[PDB]
Structures are given as C-alpha cells and as structure tokens.
Design a protein around this ligand. Structure first.
Ligand SMILES: CCN1N=C(C(F)(F)F)CC1=O
Ligand SMILES: CCN1N=C(C(F)(F)F)CC1=O
Ligand SMILES: CCN1N=C(C(F)(F)F)CC1=O
Ligand SMILES: CCN1N=C(C(F)(F)F)CC1=O
Ligand SMILES: CCN1N=C(C(F)(F)F)CC1=O
Ligand SMILES: CCN1N=C(C(F)(F)F)CC1=O
Lengths: 199, 199
C-alpha cells in the first residue's frame, strides 16, 4: 500500500463529496427544508477539512455553501456569530457575495444590504439596525434610510421593492443556476442511476 | 424533479460516504495519524445523520467507527465524555464490543477490561482505577487486581500479558480485517481508479 496514493484518493473523494453536499444544500435552501440544510451544512464543513489545496471551482463551491449558510441564518436571534465577527449574518453574506451576471449580482447585493438593516427592525433591535446601517453606508437616500430606522418605520414603502421575499426570490434564482451546473456531478449522478434502476 | 427520488439518492450517497469514511478512519487508526482520525471521525458523525434507517451492515460500520473513537481516546485526560456517561472511553468501547472470530473477540475484550483500569493508573488517577474495576468486576484474581490498584503497582507482571501495546496490536489485527472487507467499496474504488489513471 502507498500512503501517498491513499491520500490522493481521499482528496479525490473529498472533491466528489463537496459537490454532492453543495447540491444537497442548494436543494434544501430552495425547498425551505431547514433541518436538512442544517445537517448538510455540518457535513459540508467537516468534509471540506479533507481538502488542503482547492481549485478555483472548489473555492467557488465552498463560498456558495458559506454564503447560503449566512442567508439561511439571516433572521437569527443567536448572538454567537456576532459575538465572534462583530457583524450580523447578512453582513457576512454580503462580504462573501462581494467576491463570488452583473445585473443579478448587483440586485442581490442591494437586497442583502437593505435586508441586513430590515431584519434587525423586524426583530425589534433598532440599535443594531443603526449599527448595521453605519457599517454598510457610513446622501439623501442614506438620510432617508437613517430617518426610517430612527422612527422605527419598519413598513415604509422603501421595503416593498427591497423586501425579504424579493431577496429570497433573487437568491433562489441564482441557486437554480448552481443546481443546474452541479446536477450532473459524479456522486449524485451515480446515486440517481442506482435509484432509477430500482423502479 | 421528484423530492422522493432526490431523497433516495441522497441516502444511497450517504451509504457510500459512510463506507469511505470508515475505511479512512481504519487506515488513520492503523497508521497512528491522530489528526486525520479526528477529522475523519467528525465527517463520519455528520454523514451518519443522512441515514435514518440502517441495514445490518451499516449498523456494524457505524459501531466500528464509534468503537475505534473510544479506543483512540483511551488515555484521554478530558473529562467531558465521563461527565456525560459516568464511565471512561475504554469502558464505552467494551460496551460496543460486547455487541459487534470468538477467540480474537475474547482476547480483545479481556485486554480492554484490564487496560480500562491500567490507563487510569498510568495517568495517576487510582480512585478512577478502583471505580473502573468496581464497574467491570464488581474471586482471587479480582482480589489480586484490587491489591494491585490499592498498592499503585502499575508495573506488576500482570500487565505484561495484559499490556496497552498488546491491546492495540490485537485491535489493529481486527482493523486489518475491516480494511480488507471495505477496500473495494464504491467510493474508494472509483477514487483509486482516478489516481491510477494520472500515472
Ligand atoms: C424558505 C427559504 N429558507 N430556506 C432556508 C433553509 F434553511 F432551508 F436553507 C431558510 C430560509 O429562509
Ligand atoms: C466558515 C465556516 N463555514 N463552513 C461552511 C460550509 F458550509 F462551507 F461548510 C459554512 C460556514 O460558516
Ligand atoms: C450554522 C453555523 N454558522 N452560523 C453562521 C451564521 F453566520 F449564519 F450565523 C455561520 C456558521 O458557520
Ligand atoms: C498508534 C495507535 N493510535 N492511533 C490513534 C488514532 F487516533 F490515530 F486513531 C490513537 C492511537 O493510540
Ligand atoms: C455516538 C457519537 N459518535 N459517532 C461516531 C462516529 F464515528 F460513528 F461517527 C463516534 C461517536 O462517538
Ligand atoms: C471524539 C469525540 N468523542 N469522544 C469520545 C470518547 F469516548 F472517545 F472520548 C466519543 C466521542 O464521540
């Protein structure tokens, strides 16, 4: 047995597992299956430790997984992430997005920027909403948005175009493109072939 | 797309990933690669959540993984496991082993029974050594073993036959049999084929 060849095969399999888990995470996110998403994300983070050197495609795959994790936790009331990063999950999703269709990219970017503030207002945390606003936008629009937060004007018309549902719809359209690109990756294709043979 | 067929294919892939991770864990245990073992074990525990119904073979695979985890942590000074289970890792390995070659099975069983006491003595925790003895053996041999613990006779000749190294050697021989049985499982075989094609 050659330890070097065994290690290379383990890295090849880690690559296959990463694509399979990204495809699973994308489907769980699209379907709103939060518990399945939570389990798949735990598996993706563990499997990613099996790769020490990533290709450009593999880097894109791990950042998509990290991005969807932060979007899925967008309205969380758990302070552990913010205690570590000193920013909210939607702000972290924005940092990832900023690296990784320029029109769709810009639309998602602006929806996340506004919703990073709006989810704080929805949760009744207006001090955090103003803190998020200062980190993102620290202009008449900026003054209007500052007045909205100041007056706790959670249902201002500004949020009809920049809504939580519009952010989720645009992100899900992007997820459908990731789903198509990865739908024929090795592991899921072999697994689907096994299932189709039993019917 | 059929959610039912997608879920079935995810369970098929979880089965393949479980066998691959068991094979990896066995090799890391045999090689003494503790950090690789730690990462592989984290991946196996996450992947196992993708199966809700296990076959008899899959149950054997998860219990082998759980068993080797407790053998690998046999000399641990971390109290979190004992705080939860109120037993030591070697005692938990014994519980799993008791369910999972009757001669080799009995030899491993008795080596773990003695070493569950001996690792406590090695660590200078003789109160735990006596507590482990009472849980396992609570007879002249029992009286001799009780006197050994009482006198802190860590290097008594009794431990030459029932040594830590003999326990690890017998367990590694059993691990080599698991390694052979799983060496041609789907995922590692496909991965090895990819690596062999690049040379
Ligand atoms: C319905 C959209 N959605 N999907 C989520 C998860 F967790 F499944 F990815 C959270 C979330 O808001
Ligand atoms: C940086 C840690 N991490 N890894 C993640 C994933 F999904 F890629 F495994 C999500 C996440 O927060
Ligand atoms: C699910 C664990 N987790 N929480 C994160 C965030 F930001 F979404 F809250 C990142 C991360 O790894
Ligand atoms: C050398 C034998 N061995 N392997 C171990 C691990 F962690 F790699 F599985 C711990 C241990 O005592
Ligand atoms: C019962 C939790 N657990 N799962 C393990 C493995 F390896 F099977 F994933 C080891 C372990 O202690
Ligand atoms: C590695 C985490 N862990 N520790 C265990 C033991 F018993 F070995 F200490 C079981 C388990 O799941």
């Amino acid at each position: 047995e050659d330890a070097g060849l065994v290690a290379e095969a383990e890295a090849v399999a880690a690559g296959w597992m990463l694509d399979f888990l990204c495809l699973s995470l994308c489907r769980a996110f699209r379907d709103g299956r939060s518990e399945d998403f939570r389990r798949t994300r735990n598996s993706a983070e563990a499997i990613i430790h099996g790769l020490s050197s990533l290709t450009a495609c593999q880097l894109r795959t791990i950042y998509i997984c990290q991005f969807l994790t932060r979007i899925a936790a967008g309205k969380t009331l758990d302070a552990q992430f913010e205690n570590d990063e000193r920013i909210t999950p939607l702000e972290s999703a924005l940092m990832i997005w900023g690296s990784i269709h320029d029109k769709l990219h810009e639309e998602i970017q602006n929806l996340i920027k506004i919703q990073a503030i709006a989810v704080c207002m929805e949760n009744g945390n207006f001090k955090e909403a103003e803190e998020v606003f200062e980190r993102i936008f620290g202009m008449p629009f900026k003054s209007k948005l500052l007045m909205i937060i100041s007056q706790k004007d959670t249902f201002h018309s500004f949020f009809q175009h920049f809504s939580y549902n519009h952010m989720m719809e645009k992100i899900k359209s992007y997820v459908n493109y990731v789903l198509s690109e990865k739908s024929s990756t090795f592991l899921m294709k072999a697994a689907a072939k096994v299932v189709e043979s039993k019917r």
